[PDB]
């Protein structure tokens, strides 16, 4: 499967998913990152990997379908068969993941359905839970609801902060989201046409 990564940042998921499909027997390849922001982190990883890259400015256009046409073209150019979200930040218009339903996957830093949204971290530390984590999961129109793959516990320390519960969680997050890809991208899981995940 040809792979496009969409990044907003840092891009530390971005760099596990690069190292997982170059080992041998890896069913992907990642042929393009697409960056929303220009100057970030992510964009100069993929760069030194030797994998081409774009920035789509998302305040450059009136609306989100509009921004969404723009990657969507790109990814065509490079037909790609799946698209991971690695660290973006964008909500994505419903045309756009209607197209890619069953196609693109999510990695979150909760154990959904606790925590969905932007700040889960800050969100586990004002709950006070002790055990936390991340989760891969198709993405659906709905924010942090569509069908999850993969998931895994992560301990949260009494006197985390964000940054601290955010690098432990981030170690978990480079083990499943690359061991995701790999199992949508061999057929291994697929999005069942019950709406519901399928294991072949
Ligand atoms: N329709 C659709 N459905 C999805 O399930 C997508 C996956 C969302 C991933 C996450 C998510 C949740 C909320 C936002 C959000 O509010 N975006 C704002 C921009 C906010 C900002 O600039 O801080 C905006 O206006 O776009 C950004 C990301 C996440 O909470 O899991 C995390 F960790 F990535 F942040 C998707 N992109 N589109
Ligand atoms: N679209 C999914 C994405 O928002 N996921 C979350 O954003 C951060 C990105 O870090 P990173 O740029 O070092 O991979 C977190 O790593 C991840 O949980």
């Not at 990883?45 to 609306?63: S, W």
């Not at 601290?164 to 083990?175: F, G, I």
Request: glycine fraction near 8%.
């Amino acid at each position: 499967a040809r792979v496009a990564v969409l990044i907003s940042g840092t891009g530390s998921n971005l760099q596990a998913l690069i190292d997982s499909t170059r080992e041998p027997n890896s069913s992907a390849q990642i042929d393009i990152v697409i960056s929303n922001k220009a100057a970030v982190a992510g964009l100069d990883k993929a760069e030194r990997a030797g994998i081409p890259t774009r920035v789509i400015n998302h305040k450059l256009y009136k609306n989100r379908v509009e921004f969404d046409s723009a990657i969507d073209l790109v990814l065509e150019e490079f037909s790609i068969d799946i698209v991971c979200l690695a660290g973006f930040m964008r909500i994505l218009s419903g045309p756009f993941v209607q197209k890619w339903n069953g196609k693109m996957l999510n990695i979150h830093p909760s154990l959904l359905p606790s925590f969905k949204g932007s700040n889960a971290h800050e969100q586990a530390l004002e709950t006070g839970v002790t055990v936390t984590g991340c989760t891969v999961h198709f993405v659906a129109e709905d924010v942090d609801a569509g069908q999850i793959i993969l998931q895994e516990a992560v301990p949260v320390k009494r006197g985390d902060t964000v940054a601290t519960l955010s690098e432990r969680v981030k170690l978990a997050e480079h083990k499943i989201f690359p061991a995701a890809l790999q199992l949508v991208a061999s057929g291994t899981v697929q999005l069942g046409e019950n709406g519901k995940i399928c294991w072949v």
